[PDB]
Amino acid sequence: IEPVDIEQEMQRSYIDYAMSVIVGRALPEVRDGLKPVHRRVLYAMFDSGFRPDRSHAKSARSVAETMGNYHPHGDASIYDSLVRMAQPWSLRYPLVDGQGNFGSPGNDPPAAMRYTEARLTPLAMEMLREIDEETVDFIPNYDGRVQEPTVLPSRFPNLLANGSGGIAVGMATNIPPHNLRELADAVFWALENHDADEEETLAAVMGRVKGPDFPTAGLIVGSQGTADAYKTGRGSIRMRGVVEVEEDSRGRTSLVITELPYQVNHDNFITSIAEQVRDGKLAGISNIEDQSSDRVGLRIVIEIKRDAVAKVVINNLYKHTQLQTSFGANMLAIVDGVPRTLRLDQLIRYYVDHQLDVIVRRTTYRLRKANERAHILRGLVKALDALDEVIALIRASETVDIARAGLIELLDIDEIQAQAILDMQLRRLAALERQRIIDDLAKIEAEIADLEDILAKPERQRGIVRDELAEIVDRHGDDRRTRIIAI
Amino acid sequence: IEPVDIEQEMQRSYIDYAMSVIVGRALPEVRDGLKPVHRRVLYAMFDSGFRPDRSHAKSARSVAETMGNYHPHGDASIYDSLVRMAQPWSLRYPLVDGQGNFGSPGNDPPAAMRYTEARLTPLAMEMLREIDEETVDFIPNYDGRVQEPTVLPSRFPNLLANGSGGIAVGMATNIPPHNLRELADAVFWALENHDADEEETLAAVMGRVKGPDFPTAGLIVGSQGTADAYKTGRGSIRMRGVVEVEEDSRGRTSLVITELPYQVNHDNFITSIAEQVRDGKLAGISNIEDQSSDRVGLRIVIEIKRDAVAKVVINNLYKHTQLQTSFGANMLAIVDGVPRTLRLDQLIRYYVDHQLDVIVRRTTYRLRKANERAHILRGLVKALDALDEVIALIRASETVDIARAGLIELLDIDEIQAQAILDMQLRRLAALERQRIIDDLAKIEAEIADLEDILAKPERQRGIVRDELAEIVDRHGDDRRTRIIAI
Amino acid sequence: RKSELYVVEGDSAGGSAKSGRDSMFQAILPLRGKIINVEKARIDRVLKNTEVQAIITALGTGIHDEFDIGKLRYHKIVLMADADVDGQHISTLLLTLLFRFMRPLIENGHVFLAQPPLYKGLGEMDAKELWETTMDPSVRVLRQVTLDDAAAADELFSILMGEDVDARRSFITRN
Amino acid sequence: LPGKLADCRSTDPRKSELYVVEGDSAGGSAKSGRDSMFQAILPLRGKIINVEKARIDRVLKNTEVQAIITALGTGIHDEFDIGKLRYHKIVLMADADVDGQHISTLLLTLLFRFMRPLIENGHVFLAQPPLYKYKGLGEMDAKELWETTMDPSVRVLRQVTLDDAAAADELFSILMGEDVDARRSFITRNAK
DNA sequence: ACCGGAAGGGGTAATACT
DNA sequence: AGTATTACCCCTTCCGGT
Numbered sequence A, B: 001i002e003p004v005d006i007e008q009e010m011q012r013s014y015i016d017y018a019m020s021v022i023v024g025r026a027l028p029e030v031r032d033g034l035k036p037v038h039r040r041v042l043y044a045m046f047d048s049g050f051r052p053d054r055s056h057a058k059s060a061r062s063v064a065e066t067m068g069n070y071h072p073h074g075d076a077s078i079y080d081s082l083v084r085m086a087q088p089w090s091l092r093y094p095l096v097d098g099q100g101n102f103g104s105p106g107n108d109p110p111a112a113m114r115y116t117e118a119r120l121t122p123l124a125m126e127m128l129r130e131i132d133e134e135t136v137d138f139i140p141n142y143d144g145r146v147q148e149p150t151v152l153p154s155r156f157p158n159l160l161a162n163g164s165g166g167i168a169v170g171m172a173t174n175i176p177p178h179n180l181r182e183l184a185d186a187v188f189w190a191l192e193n194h195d196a197d198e199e200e201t202l203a204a205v206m207g208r209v210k211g212p213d214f215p216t217a218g219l220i221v222g223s224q225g226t227a228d229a230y231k232t233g234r235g236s237i238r239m240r241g242v243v244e245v246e247e248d249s250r251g252r253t254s255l256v257i258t259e260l261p262y263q264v265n266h267d268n269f270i271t272s273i274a275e276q277v278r279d280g281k282l283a284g285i286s287n288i289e290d291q292s293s294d295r296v297g298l299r300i301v302i303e304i305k306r307d308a309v310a311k312v313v314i315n316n317l318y319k320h321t322q323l324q325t326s327f328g329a330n331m332l333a334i335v336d337g338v339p340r341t342l343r344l345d346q347l348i349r350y351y352v353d354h355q356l357d358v359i360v361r362r363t364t365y366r367l368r369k370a371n372e373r374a375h376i377l378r379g380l381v382k383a384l385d386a387l388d389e390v391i392a393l394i395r396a397s398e399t400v401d402i403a404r405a406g407l408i409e410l411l412d413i414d415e416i417q418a419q420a421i422l423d424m425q426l427r428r429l430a431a432l433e434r435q436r437i438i439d440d441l442a443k444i445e446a447e448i449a450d451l452e453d454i455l456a457k458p459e460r461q462r463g464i465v466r467d468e469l470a471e472i473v474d475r476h477g478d479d480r481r482t483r484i485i486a487i
Numbered sequence C: 001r002k003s004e005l006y007v008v009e010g011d012s013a014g015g016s017a018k019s020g021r022d023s024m025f026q027a028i029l030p031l032r033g034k035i036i037n038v039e040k041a042r043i044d045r046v047l048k049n050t051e052v053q054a055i056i057t058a059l060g061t062g063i064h065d066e067f068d069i070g071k072l073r074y075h076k077i078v079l080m081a082d083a084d085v086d087g088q089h090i091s092t093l094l095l096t097l098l099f100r101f102m103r104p105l106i107e108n109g110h111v112f113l114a115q116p117p118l119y120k121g122l123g124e125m126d127a128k129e130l131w132e133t134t135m136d137p138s139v140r141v142l143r144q145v146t147l148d149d150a151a152a153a154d155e156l157f158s159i160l161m162g163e164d165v166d167a168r169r170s171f172i173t174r175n
Numbered sequence D: 001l002p003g004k005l006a007d008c009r010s011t012d013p014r015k016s017e018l019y020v021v022e023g024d025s026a027g028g029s030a031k032s033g034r035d036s037m038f039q040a041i042l043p044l045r046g047k048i049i050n051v052e053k054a055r056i057d058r059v060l061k062n063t064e065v066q067a068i069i070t071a072l073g074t075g076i077h078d079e080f081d082i083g084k085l086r087y088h089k090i091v092l093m094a095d096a097d098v099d100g101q102h103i104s105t106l107l108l109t110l111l112f113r114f115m116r117p118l119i120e121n122g123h124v125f126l127a128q129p130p131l132y133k134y135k136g137l138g139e140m141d142a143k144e145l146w147e148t149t150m151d152p153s154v155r156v157l158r159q160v161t162l163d164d165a166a167a168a169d170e171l172f173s174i175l176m177g178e179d180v181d182a183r184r185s186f187i188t189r190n191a192k
Numbered sequence E: 001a002c003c004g005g006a007a008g009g010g011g012t013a014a015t016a017c018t
Numbered sequence F: 001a002g003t004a005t006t007a008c009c010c011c012t013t014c015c016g017g018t
């Protein structure tokens, strides 16, 4: 019974929905490269106990855990995201190890939640490394029951390595996958040259990074589009498949297709070519067949009847039947909660800063824990110095409280330490343990100094980041799947 | 290739399928009164922690746990059973507390599963009471990973207090719900008269239990169908609704239907009445409407224009529109893996035997635990007798093994006793704990004596069962919703 | 003249509101998700969806030129939606469908918006909880839509839900 | 032709093979690991209609039955011609649980009621999958399906043979007929 | 022709951009 | 017309007994 307007209600509702979709539904994050659904699924799979060192678990359990505790949305979208993260032909570096029928590059759909099973991958466990050491912030969920992270540590640059793609209200995002081994060099250059300007950093990074490396091999023609995309943030890259010419015993020529560009359907290609063959298109084709066996890969056979010696038919296929396509790269990402268009150096610097912050936080947490343990152990050894008197006072006590009070007033020891004093086990009274206490204290008081020295010098942090990233790259590396040629 | 023939394959396949359906798909167990799906759902919800003390949890989590761990079937047949076990109009005593839209007696589907939450009820807790004390056998699941129970303790007679209904290959079962107090009286009589023969026990349990008590209130006419069902196992029970005659200010007479028989659709009733009125041949009826509000209950209004004095219209409604229906009671159960039809005395004696076996096994487990616990306390007091020498021996040692050998040689104790001495904390060395150990040893010896005495005489187990059943009945119990009238 | 119409999404919330309503002066209509954007699609395309036809049949009035307010079946059309972000989108789509087709039905005061208490929607509330909060005529609180400027409202509608994308993006960024 | 059929490449009926498999996930998994030259997959849906109980006019309108009849190519009842057969090997491949064993018996009773000469000539085969390395055919991938079941060099198939016609005629009516007392007595007698 | 455990599967919309 | 996260929903069969 209140006279509200229609313009105000319309504007408020539409603005709220648009901001929600833009910030928390579709656009990726510069620091981590994961949408909220992907991050929630990964965290739910990590915390529930699904790890590469354990056997496969049903995807239904992980989907239900994500739907209940963290993600308050439908099940179909969550399962679709989980299936997509485990597809080698869609992700350059998969983040989910799946067992079952997870789909096909053509029109075949994946099986239901009841059949397929899924766990994490060894490369995905590097994204969640040291997440319990207060490396990242935590926030309560929608109902305020449990806590979920705001961003994964992301020890490797997932955003560029796997790419991104999304549609928002008034915006869109498309980022092509890259090669980890060549991104490592760019990150090392950024780490070693922290006092570099924008132009020099951009030039060096573009020199170190050649271009995109799509998971489906293919081919890239030209070099102007990649330069335009890296210099500004919006450019077209021309992708092309491979065609091989072969003959038979009778001398009939043939065309063999074994690779297709990124995000190009297999059944749609064959259907479009067949229909355009039935109609008056191309120049000459006898018949088309598909022989893409499971153990062979992809093999599409096209028969040219008598002429053209497989020279102009290839050009016609390139310019007519989606054998050559375009990728409209447009790098859009969310920084500190706001969308922005960024170049390559911007992403590299943001990732480096995130890694440095994670390292600093982990070092601080470890230092605090080691300091508290050292305090407890020092109190314990001070108690051990007077074992006969301690045991005599403990034995001649009416209850625990008076014993604790006498321990406090005798050894000049405060609380917490006295509780561990009274928590001795007799098994730890032999001389071996009485010397093990000394050894442990000696180790810990040096570990504290080492951690303080690490915290005191940024060069140590940069070296730690470089060493860890180098080890990660050395363990998990790949070649250039996509070959880049000239015009 | 193999000539497998046609007759052998047909017989093998159909016999296997029929036997599986008969045994583990439809027919309920006499001792527990639950189908395998219900038992698996209850066990999964109990193990996952969804207890009445804790808040409601999403039903998706319970369904996923049940499907992934225990039940290797579809999610529809699991959620349907889960939502049916929490419907007050379908179960006399619900076993699940559900929050959300769980359905309607009409044609409204039960919500979706992502909107509804579910947890266990106090009755299900009594059903799952003392299940971890080796009371029932356990078997591995389909994949052999974990263990699941083969029968729930069933501290109260669920089979007769909730009824059953199922269709199998070659047979079907139908059992009407009863009242808890009337079943308790019969069970008490059976317990106190264990030496009675079949005829006397049957007569006593037929005297104590009057007849079925459907959750939808209603009515029942005659007393021969229930007698036939209880004496032979098959019978017909006639149920009838509740109609009242009212008059308005003008003088028109209206029939108000406030109760309907068991398992009668509310919307289909009105639809059938309207169609029969349109087709005629029923009676002089003005209009039919549904005024059943949420805060009012079932209330169906039928208007008769001027005649029949609201007497023959009632008889026509009885005879033509399902206001008076029949129930084909046919008590079929599974005993030791075999389907049989049983009378009331059999269904009482089997439950009594199950309760006695459960009590015996629980008492044996408790006695074994107490006997194995007393050894550690005896070793502890033996060490406390020579505490100073024990401490001196422990201090003058180089390794824990030397201390163990010295303690064994000195105190004449087992390895377990020496280990318990070694992992004794210092806080338990005060005088108060020294006396507490003596008191605990005395109490443990007294409890061992009591547990042995319980097994010594069988006449105490019956008293224990009677006391527990009396407490359960006095806690939860309703009155006769369905009243019995004459012909 | 006294009946009320409640438009909801989904059969779950639809049944939940149906079983906890006052059947005398309350009717409930469920939908099947988001509405087709009338402003974007052609008139032929929108006039074929099985849900828009249901809405026009339920309301009973005409569309566009052949609109007669004397054939209205319910004098109170209340748009019920969930409290999440999706509930703020579907409703707005409806707020276009009533503005484009049944334009002279809004400024007369026959359209209202309900305010559920703050659950993730009406599908979780049972029958009893939907009475004393949103459906009781003595407890419920609604909002009544009013029209003041026609050209401003039309231009806002076209900017927000038209076919131009750059203008919508600029408006969203600016405000 | 049925819209769910995945026809092979060879046009010679003497070398082609048709696989009848329940569901769609199993069919999709088998389509990737099959030899496209001599193997065609026909994915059914749910449980088959019981031809022995329903009337002729009702079983002639079921989508699955019509799809099977169209895919096989031959006629039904007295209009059956063996010369129009397209696949010389119809292989039933179902799951290893009781539900698969029931779908298999429904399909076998359909083929016996409508296309008896196919069973007479031994054109029908049964395929068994491995037990454990598996509660369903949808949990397997293309490589494991090919390595054990669909590989012509390493596989085991069962051939259904019909020696006596009267015994089969009476047994099918006893097991899958309208009567219940005879079926219950048969089940009870054969249980032990 | 329902009552209850089981098998299986498709189709309408928003929102951008090439 | 297709990419990818979002909203929502129905329709065949088996197996008895009245």
Ligand SMILES: O=c1ccc2ncc(=O)n3c2n1CC3CN1CCC(NCc2cc3c(cn2)OCCC3)CC1
Binding pocket: A060, A063, A064, A075, A112, A113, A114, B060, B061, B063, B064, B075, E009, E010, F009, F010
């Ligand atoms: O309403 C319809 C109308 C047509 C239709 N056609 C094919 C089809 O598959 N479906 C059609 N529908 C609906 C529906 C599938 N429906 C929704 C998804 C659900 N997923 C199975 C599942 C879900 C969950 C599980 C396990 N399995 O555990 C955690 C919680 C969620 C299965 C039933």
Ligand SMILES: [Mg+2]
Binding pocket: C082, C084, C086, C087, C120, C121
């Ligand atoms: Mg919602």
Ligand SMILES: [Mg+2]
Binding pocket: B073, D095, D097, D099, D135, D136
């Ligand atoms: Mg199965």
